[PDB]
Amino acid sequence: ADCAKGKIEFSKYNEDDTFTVKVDGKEYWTSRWNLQPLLQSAQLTGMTVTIKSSTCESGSGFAEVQFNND
Amino acid sequence: ADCAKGKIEFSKYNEDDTFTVKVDGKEYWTSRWNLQPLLQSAQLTGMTVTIKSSTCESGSGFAEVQFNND
Amino acid sequence: ADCAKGKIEFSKYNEDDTFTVKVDGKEYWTSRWNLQPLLQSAQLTGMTVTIKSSTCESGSGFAEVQFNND
Amino acid sequence: ADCAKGKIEFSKYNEDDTFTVKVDGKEYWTSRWNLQPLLQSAQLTGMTVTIKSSTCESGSGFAEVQFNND
Amino acid sequence: ADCAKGKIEFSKYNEDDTFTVKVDGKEYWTSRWNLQPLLQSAQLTGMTVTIKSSTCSGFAEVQFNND
Amino acid sequence: REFTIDFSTQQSYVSSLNSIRTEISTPLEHISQGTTSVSVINHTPPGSYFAVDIRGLDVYQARFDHLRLIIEQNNLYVAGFVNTATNTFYRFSDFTHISVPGVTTVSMTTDSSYTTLQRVAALERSGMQISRHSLVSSYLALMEFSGNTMTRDASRAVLRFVTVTAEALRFRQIQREFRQALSETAPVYTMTPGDVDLTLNWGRISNVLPEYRGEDGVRVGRISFNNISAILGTVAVILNCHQPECQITGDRPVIKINNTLWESNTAAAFLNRKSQFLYTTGK
C-alpha cells in the first residue's frame, strides 16, 4: 500500500539499528542498511519520499521507498 | 550502449533489493549497492547521468553509468 | 531519556572507533558505525539532534539519536 | 608518478565495479570501492585531483589520488 | 596530544588503502576507512580538524569543528 | 493592491510583471543591474494579498476580462480566482486565512498543491503546453466553473495561469520562455523539467541567494548558476528569508566551496556517506 508521501519530519537511529522516519504524521522504520544515508539525504534536501508497505499504521516497517524531486 | 541520458527524475528502492532510477522518461534498475549513494547524490545535485548497458530495453538492469556535472 | 537536544558543537572520531558528539554542552559517544557520517553531516548543516541514553552525564554512551528539522 | 592533475571531467561506474574518472583529458580506473563516493564528491565540488600511478597511460589503473581545493 | 590543528590543506587516498591529510604544514595518515569520508567532508566544508595521537605517522583520533 | 497582467504582447506582459515586482519587492544589493534584479518580497503581515486582473488574452481587446487571481503576497501563492462577473472568489482549501472583502467567497475542498492540481487536471507540468489559445480556453473554463470542488478543466486552467503569472513573477526564465507564445507567430510554450525544478526549488533558492557576494557559482540542489547573468536570467523574485519555505532543516544557509556558494543541505546530503566498501558489504 501507499502509506505516506511527504517530507521527512524527523529521522531516528534506533537501539536495534533500524532507522525511523516520520512522514505525513506517521512513523515508519526500516532495517534496510542501504537506506540510512539515503533517507537522511532526503530529509536534508526536503525530498518528497513515498513509503510503501503492507501495513500503513504508524510504527509499521518498510523496505520500499521512492525519492522524488517534487 | 547509451540507454538514457539526463537528470534523475526519481529513484526508488524496492522490497526485492533493486534500485530503480528514471532518466529521460525510462526506468532502469541496479542491485549494485555501490550505485545507490552515487545515483542519489547525482539525483539531488542535478548531475547528468548516462545509463549504459549491453541492451537498453525498458526495465533493464544496469551496472554502468556515467556522471557529468553538466 | 532525552539527554541533550541541540546542535553538535564538535564531533570526534576516537581511537576505539567510537564517535563522540558534544550537544548542549555535554559529550556523548556512540559505537554505532553508521552514525558517524550522519552525525557529521548534521553537524555541518547545524541540524538539531536529540541524544537518547540511559545516563545523561557528559561522557555517557548512546545508541539512539533523533535528527530534527528545528 | 603524477599522471594527471585537474578537475574531474566525468566519472563512470563500470560493470566490473571499477570506477573511471577523466582528468586533464586522460581516463583512469580504480578498483578501490572507497574511492567512488570520494571522487564523486570531488567532482561535484570542483576539487583538483592528482592521479598518481606507476603507469600513466590513459586507460590505466590507479589507487592513489590527492584531493586539493582551490 | 594534539598533533595538529587547522584546515585540511590536502587529502590523499593511498595505494595501501590508508588516507593522508596535511594539516598545519604536517602530513598524517590513518588506516581507519570511515575517516576517509569524514576527513574529505571536513576538507570540503572548511572544518578545523585537530589530529590527536599518543605520538605525533599514523592517527586514529581527530576532532571536527565547524569554522 | 491590484495589478494588471496584460497578455496582449511580449512588451505588455513583461511590463506588467516588472511593475508588480517593483511594487512588491526590493532588489538584492549584490544581484542587481540597472532595474533588473533578484528582488526580495517586502514583508507584509500574514494573510496580505494582492489582486491580479488578467487582460489582453485577445490582443488589446476589452474582452475575456472577468478573471482575477488572488495572490498571497509573502509567498506569491495563488490563493484562488475571482469571477468578477459573478463576484465570486473560489478559494483553495489551504488559504482559509485569506479574506477578500466584497466578494462571495466559495471555500473549496481542493488544496492548491501542484500534486493535487496535477492529479485533478490529469496534466503533468513537465511537458505542459501553454499558448495564447490555451490561455483563452483556461479563462473560459474558469469562468464556467462553479461549486466547491475543482474540476479537471478548472485545474488545468489554474496550472496554466499560475505558471504564466506567479511562477513567471518568481522566475525571469519562465517569463522569457513563455512570452514567445504571445508573439504574432503564436508558438507554443512547453514547460520544461528545468522550469519545473526551478519552481520546486524556489524556497531553497530564496534562502541561498541573499548570501551571494559574487562567487563564481551557486549550487542549490539540482539548480546551478555559473555567473551573475545566469542568476539574473533565471531568478527575479525570492522569498524574504530574513517564511517556512526558507528552511528545510539545520540553520546554515550556505557553504562556500572552491568559490562556489553551495546550499549547505545539498553538500551535507552527499557528504553523509560512510566508507563505500563497508556500506556495500554491510547488507
Residue B27, class by beta-carbon neighbours within 10 Å (0-12 exposed, 13-18 middle, 19+ buried)? middle
- How do A60-61 and A26-30 pair as beta strands? parallel
**Which of C37, C38, C63 faces A15 most closely, judged by CB atoms?**
C63
Task: Say how far apart CA D2 and CA F1 lie, in whole Å.
Answer: 65
Place of cell 583512469: D28
List of long-range contacts for E24-29, beta carbons under 8 Å, 24+ apart: E28/E3, E28/E4, E28/E53, E28/E57, E28/E58, E28/E59, E29/E57, E29/E58, E29/E59
E38 closest CA partner among F263, D32, C43: C43
- Cβ-contact F208, F215 below 8 angstroms: no
- Cβ-contact A68, A50 below 8 angstroms: yes
The four Cα atoms B43, B48, B53, B56 give a dihedral, to 10 degrees, of 90
CA angle (F23 as vertex; F17, F29 as ends), nearest 5? 95
Residue type for position C1: A
* F167 included as an active-site residue: yes
List of long-range contacts for F176-184, beta carbons under 8 Å, 24+ apart: F176/F233, F178/F130, F179/F10, F179/F13, F179/F14, F180/F10, F181/F130, F181/F131, F181/F132, F182/F7, F182/F8, F182/F9, F182/F10, F182/F13, F182/F132, F183/F9, F183/F10
- Cβ-contact F263, F208 below 8 angstroms: yes
In sequence order, the 6+-apart residues with CB closer than 8 A to the CB of F68 are F2, F51, F52, F53, F54, F81, F82, F84
Q: What are phi and psi of B55, to 5 degrees?
A: -130, 150
Q: How far is CA C54 from the centre of its chain?
A: 14
A14 closest CA partner among C21, F272, C66: C66
**Which of F267, F273, F278 faces E44 most closely, judged by CB atoms?**
F267
Task: Say how far apart CA F44 and CA E43 lie, in whole Å.
Answer: 41
In sequence order, the 6+-apart residues with CB closer than 8 A to the CB of F253 are F207, F208, F210, F211, F241, F263, F264
Helices (H) then strands (E): counts for chain F: 11, 15
Task: Enumerate the β-bridge partners of residue D66.
Answer: D50, E12
Q: Using the 8-state DSSP alphabet, how is residue F92 labeled?
A: -
Coil, helix or strand for D54? coil
Q: Among F23, F29, F72, F167, which one carries the catalytic annotation?
A: F167
Residue type for position F113: S
Task: Say how far apart CA C13 and CA B63 lie, in whole Å.
Answer: 34
- Cβ-contact C38, A13 below 8 angstroms: yes
> Residue B10 CB: number of other CB atoms within 10 A?
18
- Cβ-contact F120, F152 below 8 angstroms: yes
Helix pair F10-24, F172-179: axis angle to 10 deg: 160
Return the C-alpha cell found at D58.
590513459
Establish if B13 touches chain A: CB-CB under 8 angstroms.
yes
Interchain proximity F276–B9, CB inside 8 Å: no
Interchain proximity F274–C37, CB inside 8 Å: yes
Q: In what order do the strands lie in the sheet with D60-61?
A: B2-6, B48-52, B64-68, D8-13, D19-23, D26-30, D60-61
End-to-end Cα spacing for chain E: 22
Return the C-alpha cell found at E41.
567532508
Return the C-alpha cell found at B35.
550505485
The minimum CA-CA distance between F263 and chain E, rounded to whole Å, is 11
Residue type for position F217: G
Residues of A in contact with C35 (CB under 8 A): 13
In sequence order, the 6+-apart residues with CB closer than 8 A to the CB of B26 are B3, B4, B51, B58
Task: Say how far apart CA F249 and CA C70 lie, in whole Å.
Answer: 6
Q: Give the largest CA-CA distance in chain A.
A: 32
Q: Using the 8-state DSSP alphabet, how is residue D10 labeled?
A: E
- Cβ-contact F100, F89 below 8 angstroms: yes
Coil, helix or strand for D53? coil
Task: Enumerate the β-bridge partners of residue D60.
Answer: D28
- Cβ-contact F177, F139 below 8 angstroms: no
- Cβ-contact F211, F262 below 8 angstroms: no
Helices (H) then strands (E): counts for chain D: 1, 7
Task: Say how far apart CA F196 and CA F192 lie, in whole Å.
Answer: 6
Residues of E in contact with D32 (CB under 8 A): 13, 17
Residues of F with CB under 8 A from a CB of D: 257-260, 262, 267, 270-271, 273, 275-277, 280
Residues of D in contact with B38 (CB under 8 A): 13, 36-37, 40
B69 closest CA partner among A58, F117, D46, F33: D46
**CB contact burial F7-21 (16+ within 10 A = b; e otherwise):** bbbbebbbebbbebb
- Chain C residue at shortest CA distance from E35: C13
The four Cα atoms F9, F12, F14, F17 give a dihedral, to 10 degrees, of -130
Would you mind telling me the total number of residues written for chain A in this entry? 70
Which helix H or strand E contains D27, and what residues bound it? strand D26-30
- Cβ-contact C14, E61 below 8 angstroms: yes
Task: Say how far apart CA C12 and CA C29 lie, in whole Å.
Answer: 9
- Cβ-contact F92, F110 below 8 angstroms: yes
Residues of B in contact with F273 (CB under 8 A): 37, 41
Task: Say how far apart CA F157 and CA F141 lie, in whole Å.
Answer: 7
DSSP C4-43: EEEEEEEEEE-TTS-EEEEETTEEEEE--TTHHHHHHHHH
- Cβ-contact B47, D10 below 8 angstroms: no
Task: Say how far apart CA F39 and CA F32 lie, in whole Å.
Answer: 8
Task: Say how far apart CA F249 and CA C38 lie, in whole Å.
Answer: 14
- How do B19-23 and B8-13 pair as beta strands? antiparallel
Q: What are phi and psi of A30, to 5 degrees?
A: -135, 140
- Cβ-contact F103, F88 below 8 angstroms: yes
The four Cα atoms D36, D38, D42, D44 give a dihedral, to 10 degrees, of 70
Resolution (A): 1.8
The four Cα atoms F271, F277, F282, F283 give a dihedral, to 10 degrees, of 90
Residue type for position C65: V
Coil, helix or strand for F148? coil
> Residue F95 CB: number of other CB atoms within 10 A?
23
Coil, helix or strand for D52? strand
Interchain proximity F269–B44, CB inside 8 Å: yes
Q: How far is CA A58 from the centre of its chain?
A: 11
Task: Say how far apart CA F267 and CA E47 lie, in whole Å.
Answer: 13
- Chain F residue at shortest CA distance from E43: F257
Coil, helix or strand for D12? strand
Coil, helix or strand for F162? helix
- How do A48-52 and A64-68 pair as beta strands? antiparallel
Coil, helix or strand for F183? coil
Interchain proximity D45–F273, CB inside 8 Å: no
CA angle (D2 as vertex; F270, F280 as ends), nearest 5? 30
The minimum CA-CA distance between D23 and chain E, rounded to whole Å, is 16
Return the C-alpha cell found at A38.
539515503
Domain assignments of chain A as residue spans, ordered by start: 1-70
In sequence order, the 6+-apart residues with CB closer than 8 A to the CB of F146 are none
Establish if C54 touches chain A: CB-CB under 8 angstroms.
no
Query: What technique solved it?
Result: X-ray
Residues of B in contact with A34 (CB under 8 A): 13, 33, 36
